[PDB]
Amino acid sequence: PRGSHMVKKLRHLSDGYWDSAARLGVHGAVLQAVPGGRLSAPDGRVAVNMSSYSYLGLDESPRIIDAAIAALRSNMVLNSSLSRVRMTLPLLEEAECALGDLFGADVATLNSCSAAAWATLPVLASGLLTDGVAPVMVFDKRAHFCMASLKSLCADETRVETIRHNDVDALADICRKNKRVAYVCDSVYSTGGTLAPLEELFALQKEFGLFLYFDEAHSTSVIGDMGRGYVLDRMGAINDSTMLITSLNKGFGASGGAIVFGPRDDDRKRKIIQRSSGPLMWSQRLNTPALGAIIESAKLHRSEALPELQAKLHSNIALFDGLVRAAGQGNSVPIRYLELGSEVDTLEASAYLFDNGFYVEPDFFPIVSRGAAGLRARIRSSMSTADIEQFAHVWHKLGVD
Amino acid sequence: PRGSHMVKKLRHLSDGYWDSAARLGVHGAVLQAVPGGRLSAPDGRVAVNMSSYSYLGLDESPRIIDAAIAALRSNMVLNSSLSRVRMTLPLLEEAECALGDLFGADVATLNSCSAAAWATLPVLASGLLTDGVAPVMVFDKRAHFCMASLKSLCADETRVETIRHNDVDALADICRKNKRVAYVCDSVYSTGGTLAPLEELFALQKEFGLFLYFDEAHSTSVIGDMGRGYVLDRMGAINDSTMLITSLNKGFGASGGAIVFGPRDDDRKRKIIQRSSGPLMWSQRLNTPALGAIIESAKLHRSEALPELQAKLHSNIALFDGLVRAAGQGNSVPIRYLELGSEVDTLEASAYLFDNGFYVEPDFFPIVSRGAAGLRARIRSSMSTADIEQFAHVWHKLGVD
């Protein structure tokens, strides 16, 4: 109904930008992964990927890949061949128990974070997770599309309202005028260098019982003790009014996504969502290599390797912040947005850096608003001090301010 | 409607059936995959899975497993670490080129058939796929809920209608009274033992240019040359008013799902869907073992091994139909629905069969309508003549006819 994520019908301007990005080779490239966060082209040239989302370099960990191979060798199937509602392989239960140990919460895996949003948001909107009381579903304007695109489903169940980024004052007003409210947002935003305002949100939760739904896809692993993420690091123990969705193919170094339902010893939320007609019931479970990767990555997150990787990541951020200005400086979030304010210039920049051995993803309309084009750089712990310094060199040679 | 004691009485009823399924052990079981389509419990007791969706038994193919392990070894990463819009691994291109050669069509992979539905249904609803003219979106009542749960997304774009199951009369009427119509249906229904009315549908398409959207999850690999499925077996070459979505974790013996955009030499539908804000743009690509499995399975589907597997499957269907009466008896698709109506009888029957070495999944509400419960058997090529004959023996001891 009212809340919506309409398909873009006017695409002459946007198709022109996509076509140019492909023509310039910054999009549509067939590149091979190569050690050291690098990309190999058909001609043989090698570039450093500055926009990779494996923030801790776990996509290159031989431990994790070996545990994925081992899981497939011993199971000898890619997957079970029934819905998880009927049965699961012991490997799936071991993976979800290992994630539950790490996050300190009841956690289910799904084939993606997007499937996890589809499985949870309509159910949250129905009241079933809020004592039979349909909440007002309040979305942040900059919430990821995996969640925003499902507003119409949420509106089929309750009232959906979208508020301005971090408009805490407006959310409080909605809270004061309604019995039950929920806020759908991203813990770490991939643009603008912003973060979810936890202090005010937790207070509203205390005062009004505001249900908090967070997308931690850029928070898992990169932030917090044992990489539990930004929300759990501040919250400590998850409560019954907070639910988290996340991807495990980024910092965690595995594949798929997950729903952090709440307290580990309360099965009501898992029960409710597992028995609802959505992706957790009828979409394929993660295959056994992915589940092996999850188990090994979880052990690694619980060990002394995670602090070291977060250390090397915070260092590489400081090194980058000392040599290049970008949206976000000293926020300790490994995403830096190189504002260029010009679609044509962002694509030209991207094509230049790539010819110089550095790929930085070009953000243009419709990905970002018009005239707000920029290059999105992601800092990994797997970057060398040289990679970072050698890149700041080539960036200034472009002479953009 | 909420506030109806009935909808709460119905929930207490449904929660009772799900609780019984868990108590009876037909749901919630942790079971290991065992050779020959079998499942092992920790006490060492084993059951034949009469409900596996690996219709050609490819879940146990050593060739596919080996290819999946090899893909992980050579690539040395679980996946790439950017949106596929920026770039892709050569392995992913090899997979999609392989599927494309196999179906004779442009084909993209995604992490699930559900994601394929999410990526395509709103776009078809918008008109961008049908010459700028938003079609009337006509959903069959029994279309799988990965499609049907998204009707609201489509309704925001255009008019959505639901017709009675296989009601080709009602669909033709809609084609007369409207300029452009689309029909969303399953080629082979997930349960209920019914198929799509292809002859009538193809005629309506010739007369009114009706766009046909088919979910081929239970058709892929099961039927047709090179396993191209039910629709393409009868259509021949794909036209530009037909789109197919399918899963590749069932008969194909791999992981993930796929969108069959249409003819191989028209890039428009892929471009439009790839540039829309859905899972094809911002949800993770399949991991490298999954892509290795897709490639090896495609080679398999081109070889003489596929018609051998299809012959064994259809021979097992003939054997089963000669011995057990189920919805779908006589057709050439593996789904056989044993209608029991009562949810109590259905759960008791599944628990009885499971205690006697045969797992048969129980469909009750919300999987199917109330009072329409039943056991969902699925025929697969990995079934022995004795597995089927013995299941028939145990089944008939209940005295249902």
Ligand SMILES: Cc1ncc(COP(=O)(O)O)c(CN[C@@H](CCC(=O)O)C(=O)O)c1O
């Ligand atoms: C007709 C149909 N289309 C799409 C899907 C979704 O496929 P995915 O690729 O997994 O997203 C299903 C799932 N029906 C499966 C449920 C499978 C599972 O949960 O593992 C079934 O056959 O029972 C289906 O039956």
Ligand SMILES: Cc1ncc(COP(=O)(O)O)c(C=O)c1O
């Ligand atoms: C914040 C956020 N949430 C969700 C997703 C998608 O997650 P997945 O690929 O697991 O579906 C992304 C990736 O683009 C993301 O950046």
